[PDB]
């Protein structure tokens, strides 16, 4: 606990009841609290870094539990994930300073600034 | 008796019928100025002394409506109104009468339509 | 006429123990004592809100979220460069250039969608022949740069790996559509 | 006196840009300008095949998405002669009813909270909510649902919408009630609106009002009882229409046929026959990704279909539903070509905007906002 | 340069140019005419990203990167000079700050980007800009410094045009924005020394146009010092005239001794002393700004004028002064 | 003493709504494509819609034509008339159905 | 007519491998747009449709037969036109198999005209190996200078 | 490669043409095969029937899969 | 207002109707816009005669007529705050090309 | 030392990032889906948002639409009467780039070209998470401004 | 169809077709007069302009169409008067008999260019203020002329400087056998 | 100012459905 500077306060109101079903790599918690009321507040996550959180942190194997779209928690789905391809998450860091954020091939921020010019000069 | 026209405007008129009777014979007087081998004065001729008919045959509004079935009098009695609208603006700007080229080009075409769209009922 | 209609609609309501209900129906306001009373029980009843970063609405399989190439489960993207989703895009967001690589299967030099000239609508999922382009459920990628937020050729969107596990599902639930 | 009246609340009547002249707090003209939300949408589409041309429909009324979609698609199966089937017939009134409430649920509780009642928006909020569970889960996104194409509806329901839609007509009644109960007893609602706005019949006739502004005024004229445009024939339902024409008919009206709309949601919902989701003809519709992979004959028309398009014959004509806020009508000139040629888009609150002059004349400047909020002026069909 | 467009905000013109003050009132026009003929910038700010939000716009979506950057350090001057083939300076300070001395912030700086500008072998066109009349010997620090600036910019790197804008005005200056809101003293107006002070301001629009003009010219304007000097040699107070025709307000100047002036910006000079409290940025009666002020040195000479670059300077009477309408 | 007539008891709170998340595929789909008869017959020339339509007769209306047709138009006896969309209101509060549909 | 004509279209996209993405010509083709015009709307062939090897016709002309519907356009326009008889419609039946019976690459200038010739993707530019779509090209009637046949 | 050093700037995760020219080509009984994707059928590409007549192992050219006959 | 212009006589008749407009006008559109000034009335004058005059040889009536009424459109949108004011101060050889571009 | 710099920064930002009411320029659908943003299920009041119907006092503008070629100048006009430490969010395809309309003579390819935006909602109708995620990022945005450290060089 | 006997021959001129709508394609002339009948008769009684559509045919001669629907509330019933005015010939205007024309005949000279004659307040509705050009036309293209609008030094102006966007990509689909 | 003051009396609420009610 210890944050009353949070909404996370509202999150650590729940638990209360709840079961937690799983815990992801990255520490987040995943929590259910069905059967009592308020459908579509009985399915969320605490996700572990208390300060410093936003969305995104949800993997892609729970993203899908978490936001009702399927009832397979992430410890089902990690069956399935790809082996030969997979990679694991990387948290939107959008403006976290460069070479974190994304740059297209010509950004010039972008290690690498492709040039475009179809025509091969002399 | 009638209480008051759904319609919001169209005020119930109690002498429906007396005015109804004034207005298709001012109709039927004012018609006379439009040549008579025109569809327009065949139609205006034809429903106005039907309707001029059932207005004087019938004495209430309701068997007015019950037997001439257009709705209410007064709706009819602004029908017959923008009627002699029409009969005395279409004696101005005379558009009777058939050019001597008269290019009409009737393209009739008959595209099957499926009737899960609109059109009408 | 106005003023008939006022006559009339005041002289609807006028026998006694009718002119008293309705005197004390607007002095002690009454009709809005049942507007007060709805709001109270509104103010003590669960309240339908969701604090967000923690739990999310309800989505579908069918939610149109972040654009994902997808790829076959052994490596080799399953995005053949046949430029059916440049075609069908409403807001021409993908820029598809193709070459035929060395191994001689074509695959596309450059597959940019611009996530910000992109409506969402789903198009690309529908028009790819192998569902090469689908949308990840993430809608969770505000940019703070509009540079960042042109997704690059093949290369951004080649991060439906990771949502792979997630779009996968979608598609082995959807696909019975 | 010229007051450079502008959106009082943003983000509710997003670019109204009234110019009152004003006599005092008495209005004797009110000049509303359009063109600040006018996007190139009757030129874009006549440069994108039939199909890339349908999502611009869910974006020209934003607060009544699949009743557009349902407006062209009837547009493009009146010239493509495309029978479509049953089940798509019930599915596209099923969306097009809770559309009708998705749009009454808010351009009555944003009128509502522009008058100045706080909590019925955000009651009506969460109604929307309920039903944007709905569009996001039939076809994907919560507002712009690309879902009703032209040749029947875009993919079929999902194993448990029908079970939810249920589950919620059932707690609909209620909502409607408190909707209700919060604006119709209350004399700060009729005084807000009561003798606001009156349109003579002849006057919602004249500038071609064509919606809940002409069942106001008393005018018996809804293109679902005028023109059934789908199992609307067969469908019951009882069209409410106005005696007074004040704000507080087309209120009345409005909170009426957000009762009706759940009568024939019910109805599709008791009965939708398990029937093929889109035509039949392929080469209007393009085939399904299993059907597409295994059959050739197929995939030359999933690739035909989703570049080429219809290339729909050679006609012009003018498909008008009953969308929420009106006789919105998209006439449609068809060059033979796969694209379309010259799209126009009759969408009311360009009819009914311009009713603003005569219908707040005389009234106080704080009335202008009521009118603007019973004409369910939604900018981006102006 | 390799120009493949046709007018800008789409076009290239081969300029990733390294605007060093573009977060400044003299950099939002030069950026602005780098960015709308269509070419790179990478403006790199010094502190709050809010610097140069303002000029993410004026740039087609990467045209201008901005760029953080520390001045004192190096290694990162060269990381914002990467992919560079312009450099222009407009890394200028008017007032000492206790952090960056008269030097650290207009000449240490000017020779230390020109000289990671030479290791990076590649910069074409290196733009140095200090003010008009910053020649050594002005009693200003902040001229001497400037007059430093270029003499260590020329010999580090010749071939580098030094622009010598005198004061430039234009909306958010530091020249008549600080006269106006002094205005709001009740029309009181200092002007300082008896406006004896013969000074060219220039639209600082024409500046920046300058400032390019010498980037799109051929091999010439290389290490030929300029004078942006501009039209109409004013007088402080005949400057001050024409504030008051654009805001309304009724000439209400005074005379202040130049010694009366220096004593009124004895302090905020003991920037150096104050640690532990930044002082508020002198905008009036600032020392230096005064030590400028007394000799009229500010007047182009037979040097360089905007006529050797095809481009003649806007007056100072109407738009180029219409920023003071907003004070009405 | 309010909208509680034992009917607001369907209160918004569902709490067991959407109990089978969308993406779980307990039952599969099926969603027809084509009607049966049309599986196996692919005869389309009989289906078509879009072109299966009857040529557009544009044919020309000289004076002759119109004058012939007003001569024969003798008299616009009724049932030459178009009919009118008669819809007249009614009060009615919940009698459809006795308010449950 | 048209059941004739349904009948036959059916019949070429009955063993013709579904590589209309993956077909360079994908956009401007013979059997696509006569299958979305005067073809039926469906294919009954449900089946192992038969797949035919790429044979090397050389550095311009990309070849991939399977697709290849045995017209004999190509097989007669080799013949013909561009008058080298190299091409050959090889065996027969649906076993028919359309190229040079020994791997040689049509040695013949005014061989890469085929690919136009051919009314389905199989004979293809290999150096427009699959660069751009029917749909995107931009076409300008020009002329060319290459020799000075113009 | 040179084509997939087009877009993938990355060059540390393997390059999909490598992903694809690791897995071992396929046995097979007769003289053509389905590869009609993955496994799902609709899950995959359109079905592309590849012929088996030469020794060499002939790619599926959607998804890279290498067939060959196994006699 | 119905095109009287059956010859080009009505025509010139109103252009010399929307130049007397016009230049009565220029009165406003100084004040609005403070131009009063920068430009000179001979110099507004002169840029609205070299308006008419730049579109003079049109033997087309309607086409007049339509000039007119855009030129109508101008000013109402000048004389009101409907524009702004910046485009009004600006409304008021193959060598030095070859140099620039190949077009 | 440092240190009460990065506490009293830790609290500017800390305010800024609790209360942070944006001018919500709810130009079309977007705006509808902000309405939902702001509606009873994803709380904006919770955040401390408070969407202002005046652009004087406003911490932000959520520009939300398409930014047509007409309001444009209405749209710079109020987003020069915001208190200095503004940022702007472009809600929705159409407001942040060019969009459905990119190609759109009367469509501004992207608010980019009339204001300096600091986070662009991203999908055409964002879901009304979607929009609340990015307002979270504008938080993220304001917790990495530390603006007193900055003012002490 | 009972419209077609009584309307004189003259004023449907041209053309009249009898499905998917019906239409009387007629003069421009006779246009505001043949919308004087079809409204105030008592057989024919629209009293509801539904729609204007301006309609653009480069390849004609009278470039334009002017497409008017009508409703008709009495008798259910909708009739699209059409007529034909290129970029110069200003048509009668019908906002005296259906006030809501104003409007849609603001939009079909805004859009196009077919201006109406004694239309009060005939001006540019949709499009920009400056604008210059008629959009809806054919031969206006997509992107639009001068319609970049940025901000710069002249600060707190947009100004409208010439476009230049990421090239429309138009996709030749149209196939050959139509 | 002699503007038509919105009188807030009118007929009492008496829902009208259109006759198609029972039998169109
Ligand atoms: C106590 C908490 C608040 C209760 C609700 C406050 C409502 C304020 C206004 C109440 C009010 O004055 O209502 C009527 C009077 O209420 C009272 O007298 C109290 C106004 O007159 P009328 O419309 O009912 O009758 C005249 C209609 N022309
Ligand atoms: N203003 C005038 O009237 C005149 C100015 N000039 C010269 O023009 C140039 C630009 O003018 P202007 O933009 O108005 O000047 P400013 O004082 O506004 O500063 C402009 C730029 O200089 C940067 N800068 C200044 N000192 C430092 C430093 N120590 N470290 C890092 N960056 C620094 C600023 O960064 P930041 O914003 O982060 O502080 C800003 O980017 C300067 O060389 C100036 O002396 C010429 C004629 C007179
Ligand atoms: S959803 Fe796909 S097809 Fe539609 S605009 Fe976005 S990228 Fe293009
Ligand atoms: S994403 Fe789909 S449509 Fe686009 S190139 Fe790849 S396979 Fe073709
Ligand atoms: S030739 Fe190519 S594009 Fe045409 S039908 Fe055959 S595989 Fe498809
Ligand atoms: S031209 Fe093409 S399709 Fe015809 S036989 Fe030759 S290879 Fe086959
Ligand atoms: S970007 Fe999409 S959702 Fe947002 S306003 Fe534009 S069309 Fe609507
Ligand atoms: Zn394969």
């Not at chain 4, 398009?309 to 796969?338: D, H």
């Not at chain 6, 969603?31 to 544009?58: A, C, F, K, L, W």
């Not at chain 12, 002699?2 to 006759?19: C, I, S, V």
């Amino acid at each position: 606990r210890c944050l009353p500077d949070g909404n996370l306060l509202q999150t650590k109101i729940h638990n209360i009841g709840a079961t937690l079903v799983g815990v992801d790599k990255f520490g987040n918690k995943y929590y259910q609290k069905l059967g009592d009321t308020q459908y579509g507040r009985h399915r969320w996550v605490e996700y572990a870094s208390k300060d410093r959180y936003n969305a995104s942190q949800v993997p892609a194997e729970w993203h899908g539990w978490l936001h009702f779209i399927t009832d397979h928690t992430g410890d089902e789905l990690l069956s399935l994930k790809p082996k030969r391809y997979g990679l694991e998450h990387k948290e939107n860091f959008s403006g976290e300073g460069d070479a974190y954020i994304y740059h297209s091939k010509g950004h010039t921020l972008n290690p690498g600034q492709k040039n475009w010019t179809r025509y091969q000069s002399w | 008796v009638k209480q008051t026209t759904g319609i919001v405007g169209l005020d119930v008129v109690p002498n429906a019928r007396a005015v109804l009777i004034d207005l298709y014979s001012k109709t039927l007087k004012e018609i006379q100025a439009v040549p008579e081998d025109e569809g327009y004065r065949k139609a205006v001729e034809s429903f106005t002394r039907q309707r001029l008919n059932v207005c004087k045959e019938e004495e209430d509004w309701e068997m007015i409506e019950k037997r001439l079935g257009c709705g209410q009098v007064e709706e009819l009695i602004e029908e017959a109104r923008d009627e002699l609208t029409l009969i005395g603006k279409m004696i101005e700007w005379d558009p009777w009468g058939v050019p001597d080229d008269y290019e009409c080009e009737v393209i009739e075409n008959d595209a099957p339509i499926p009737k899960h769209v609109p059109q009408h009922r | 006429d106005d003023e008939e209609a006022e006559q009339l609609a005041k002289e609807i309501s006028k026998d006694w123990s009718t002119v008293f209900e309705r005197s004390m129906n607007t002095l002690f306001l009454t009709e809005m004592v049942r507007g007060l009373s709805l709001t109270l029980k509104y103010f003590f009843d669960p309240k339908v809100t969701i604090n967000y970063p923690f739990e999310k609405g309800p989505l579908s399989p069918r939610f149109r979220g972040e654009h994902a190439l997808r790829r076959y489960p052994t490596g080799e993207e399953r995005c053949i460069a046949c430029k059916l989703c440049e075609a069908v895009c409403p807001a021409q967001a993908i820029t598809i250039e193709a070459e035929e690589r060395e191994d001689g299967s074509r695959r596309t030099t450059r597959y940019d969608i611009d996530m910000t000239k992109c409506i969402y609508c789903g198009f690309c999922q529908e028009a790819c022949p192998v569902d090469a382009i689908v949308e990840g459920p993430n809608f969770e990628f505000a940019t703070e740069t509009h540079e960042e937020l042109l997704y690059d050729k093949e290369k951004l969107l080649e991060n439906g790996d990771r949502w792979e596990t997630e779009i996968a599902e979608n598609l082995r639930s959807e696909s019975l559509y | 006196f010229t007051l450079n009246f502008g959106p009082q609340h943003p983000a509710a009547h997003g670019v109204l840009r009234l110019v009152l002249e004003m006599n005092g707090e008495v209005v004797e003209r009110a000049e509303p300008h359009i063109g600040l939300l006018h996007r190139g949408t009757e030129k874009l589409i006549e440069y994108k095949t039939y199909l890339q041309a349908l999502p611009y429909f869910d974006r020209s009324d934003y607060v009544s998405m699949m009743a557009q979609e349902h407006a062209y698609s009837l547009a493009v199966e009146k010239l493509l002669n495309c029978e479509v089937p049953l089940r798509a017939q019930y599915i596209r009134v099923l969306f097009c009813e809770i559309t009708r409430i998705l749009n009454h649920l808010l351009a009555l509780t944003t009128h509502a909270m522009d008058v100045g009642a706080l909590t019925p928006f955000l009651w009506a909020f969460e109604e929307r909510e309920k039903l944007l569970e709905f569009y996001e889960r039939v076809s994907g996104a919560r507002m712009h649902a690309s879902f009703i194409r032209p040749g029947g509806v875009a993919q079929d329901l999902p194993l448990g919408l029908c079970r939810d839609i249920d589950s919620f007509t059932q707690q609909f009644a209620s909502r409607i009630d408190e909707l209700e109960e919060m604006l119709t007893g209350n004399r700060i609602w009729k005084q807000r609106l009561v003798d606001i706005g009156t349109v003579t019949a002849q006057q919602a006739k004249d500038w071609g009002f064509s919606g809940v502004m002409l069942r106001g005024p008393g005018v018996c004229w809804d293109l679902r009882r005028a023109a059934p445009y789908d199992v609307y024939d067969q469908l019951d339902f009882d069209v409410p229409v106005g005696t007074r024409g004040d704000c507080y008919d087309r209120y009345c009206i409005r909170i009426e046929e957000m009762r009706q709309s759940l009568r024939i949601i019910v109805q599709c919902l008791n009965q939708m026959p398990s029937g093929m989701i889109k035509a039949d003809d392929r080469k209007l519709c393009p085939p399904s990704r299993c059907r597409m992979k295994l059959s050739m004959e197929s995939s030359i028309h999933h690739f035909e279909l989703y570049t080429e398009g219809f290339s729909v014959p050679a006609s012009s004509t003018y498909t008008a539903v009953e969308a929420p806020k009106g006789e919105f009508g998209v006439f449609l000139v068809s060059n033979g070509s796969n694209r379309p040629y010259r799209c126009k888009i009759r969408a009311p609150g360009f009819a009914h905007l311009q009713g603003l002059d005569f219908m707040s004349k005389h009234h106080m400047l704080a009335d202008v906002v009521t009118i603007i909020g019973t004409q369910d002026i939604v900018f981006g069909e102006v | 340069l390799a120009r493949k467009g046709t007018g800008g905000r789409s076009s290239v013109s081969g300029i990733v140019a390294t605007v060093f003050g573009a977060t400044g009132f003299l950099g939002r026009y030069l950026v602005q005419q780098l960015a709308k003929m269509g070419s790179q910038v990478l403006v790199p700010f010094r502190g709050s990203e809010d610097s140069p939000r303002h000029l993410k716009l004026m740039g087609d979506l990467g045209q201008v990167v901005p760029m953080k950057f520390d001045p004192r350090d190096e290694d990162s001057i060269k990381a914002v000079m990467a992919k560079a083939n312009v450099v222009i300076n407009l890394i200028g300070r008017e007032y000492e700050t206790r952090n960056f001395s008269f030097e650290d912030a207009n000449h240490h700086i000017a020779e230390k980007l020109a000289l990671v500008a030479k290791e990076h072998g590649g910069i074409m066109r290196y733009i140095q800009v200090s003010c008009l009349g910053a020649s050594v010997s002005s009693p200003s620090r902040m001229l001497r410094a400037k007059a430093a600036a270029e003499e260590a910019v020329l010999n580090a790197l010749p071939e580098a045009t030094i622009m010598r804008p005198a004061t430039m005005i234009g909306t958010e200056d530091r020249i008549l924005n600080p006269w106006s809101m002094f205005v709001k003293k009740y029309g009181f107006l200092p002007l300082i020394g008896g406006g004896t002070t013969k000074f060219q301001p220039v639209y600082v629009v024409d500046v920046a146009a300058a400032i390019v003009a010498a980037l799109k010219d051929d091999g010439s304007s290389m290490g030929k010092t300029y004078e942006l000097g501009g039209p109409d040699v004013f007088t402080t107070h005949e400057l001050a005239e024409i504030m008051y025709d654009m805001i309304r307000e009724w000439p209400r100047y005074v005379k202040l001794p130049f010694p009366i002036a220096k004593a009124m910006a004895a302090p905020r000079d003991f920037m150096v002393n104050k640690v532990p409290f930044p002082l508020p940025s002198p905008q009036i009666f600032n020392l230096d700004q005064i030590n400028a002020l007394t000799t009229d040195t500010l007047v182009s000479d037979n040097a360089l004028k905007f006529q050797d670059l095809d481009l003649v300077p806007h007056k100072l009477k109407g738009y180029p002064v219409e920023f003071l309408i907003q004070y009405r | 003493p309010c909208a509680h007539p034992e009917y607001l008891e369907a209160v918004p709170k569902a709490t067991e709504y959407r109990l089978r998340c969308p993406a779980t595929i307990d039952e599969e789909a099926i969603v027809p494509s084509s009607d049966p008869e049309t599986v196996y017959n692919i005869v389309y020339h009989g289906r078509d819609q879009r072109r299966n339509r009857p040529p557009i007769r544009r044919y020309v209306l000289t004076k002759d034509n119109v004058v012939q047709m007003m001569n024969e138009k003798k008299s616009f006896d009724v049932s030459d008339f178009p009919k009118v969309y008669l819809t007249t209101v009614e009060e009615d509060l919940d009698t459809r159905g006795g308010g449950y549909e | 007519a048209k059941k004739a004509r349904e009948g036959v279209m059916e019949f070429l996209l009955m063993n013709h491998p579904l590589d209309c993405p993956i077909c360079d010509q994908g956009g401007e083709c013979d059997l696509q747009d006569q299958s979305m015009a005067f073809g039926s709307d469906r294919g009954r062939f449900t089946e192992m449709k038969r797949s035919v090897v790429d044979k090397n016709l050389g550095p311009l002309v990309k070849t991939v037969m399977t697709r290849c519907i045995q017209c004999t356009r190509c097989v007669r326009f080799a013949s013909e036109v561009a008058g080298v008889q190299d091409l050959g419609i090889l065996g027969r039946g649906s076993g028919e198999e359309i190229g040079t019976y020994v791997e040689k690459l049509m040695t013949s200038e005014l061989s890469g005209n085929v690919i136009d010739i051919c009314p389905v993707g199989a004979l293809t530019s290999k150096p427009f190996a699959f660069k751009a779509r029917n749909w995107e090209l931009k076409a300008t009637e020009t002329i060319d200078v290459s020799d000075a046949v113009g | 490669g040179n084509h997939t050093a087009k877009w993938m700037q990355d060059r540390s995760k393997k390059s999909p043409m490598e992903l694809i020219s690791e897995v071992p080509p396929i046995k097979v009984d007769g003289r053509i095969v389905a590869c009609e994707g993955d496994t799902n059928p609709a899950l995959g590409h359109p079905i592309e029937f590849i012929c088996l007549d030469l020794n060499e192992p002939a790619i599926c050219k959607y998804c890279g899969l290498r067939y060959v006959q196994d006699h | 207002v119905p095109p009287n212009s059956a010859n080009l006589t009505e025509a010139r008749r109103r252009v010399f109707d929307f130049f007397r407009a016009a230049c009565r006008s220029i009165p406003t559109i100084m004040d609005i816009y403070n131009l009063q000034d920068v430009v000179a009335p001979s110099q507004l004058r002169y840029a609205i005669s070299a308006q008419i005059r730049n579109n003079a040889h049109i033997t087309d009536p309607k086409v007049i007529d339509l000039l007119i009424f855009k030129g109508m459109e101008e000013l109402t949108d000048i004389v009101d705050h409907a524009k702004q004011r910046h485009h009004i101060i600006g409304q008021y050889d193959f060598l030095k090309n070859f140099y620039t571009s190949n077009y | 030392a440092e240190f009460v710099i990065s506490k009293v920064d830790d609290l500017m930002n800390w305010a800024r990032t609790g209360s942070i009411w944006p001018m919500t320029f709810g130009l079309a659908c977007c705006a509808v889906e902000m309405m939902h943003t702001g509606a009873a299920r994803y709380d904006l009041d919770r955040f401390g948002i408070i969407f202002r119907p005046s652009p004087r006092q406003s911490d932000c503008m959520i520009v939300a639409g398409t930014l047509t070629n007409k309001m444009a100048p209405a749209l710079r006009k109020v987003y020069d009467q915001m208190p200095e430490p503004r940022w702007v969010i472009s809600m929705g395809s159409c407001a942040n780039g060019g969009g459905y309309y990119h190609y759109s003579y009367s469509v501004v390819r992207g608010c980019d070209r009339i204001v300096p935006v600091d986070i662009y909602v991203p999908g055409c109708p964002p879901t009304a998470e979607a929009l609340l995620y990015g307002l979270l990022q504008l938080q993220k945005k304001i917790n990495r401004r530390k603006d007193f450290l900055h003012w002490w060089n | 169809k009972y419209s077609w006997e009584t309307l004189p021959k003259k004023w449907v001129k041209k053309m009249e077709r009898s499905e998917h709508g019906n239409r009387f394609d007629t003069n421009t002339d006779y246009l505001f007069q043949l919308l004087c009948f079809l409204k105030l008769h008592t057989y024919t009684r629209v009293q509801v302009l539904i729609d204007i559509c301006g309609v653009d045919y480069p390849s004609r001669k009278r470039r334009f169409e002017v497409v008017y629907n009508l409703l008709s509330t009495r008798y259910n019933s909708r009739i699209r008067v059409q007529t034909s005015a290129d970029e110069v010939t200003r048509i009668s205007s019908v906002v005296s008999l259906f006030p809501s024309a104003g409007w849609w005949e603001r939009e079909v000279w805004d859009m196009f260019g077919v201006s109406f004659i004694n239309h009060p307040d005939l001006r540019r509705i949709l499009t920009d203020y400056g604008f210059e050009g008629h959009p809806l036309r054919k031969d206006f293209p997509l992107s639009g002329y001068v319609q970049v609008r940025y901000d710069d030094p002249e600060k707190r102006v947009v100004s409208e400087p010439i476009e230049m966007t990421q090239e429309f990509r138009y996709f030749d689909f149209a196939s050959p056998w139509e | 100012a002699a503007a038509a003051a919105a009188a807030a009396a009118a007929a009492a609420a008496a829902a009208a459905a259109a006759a198609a009610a029972a039998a169109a």
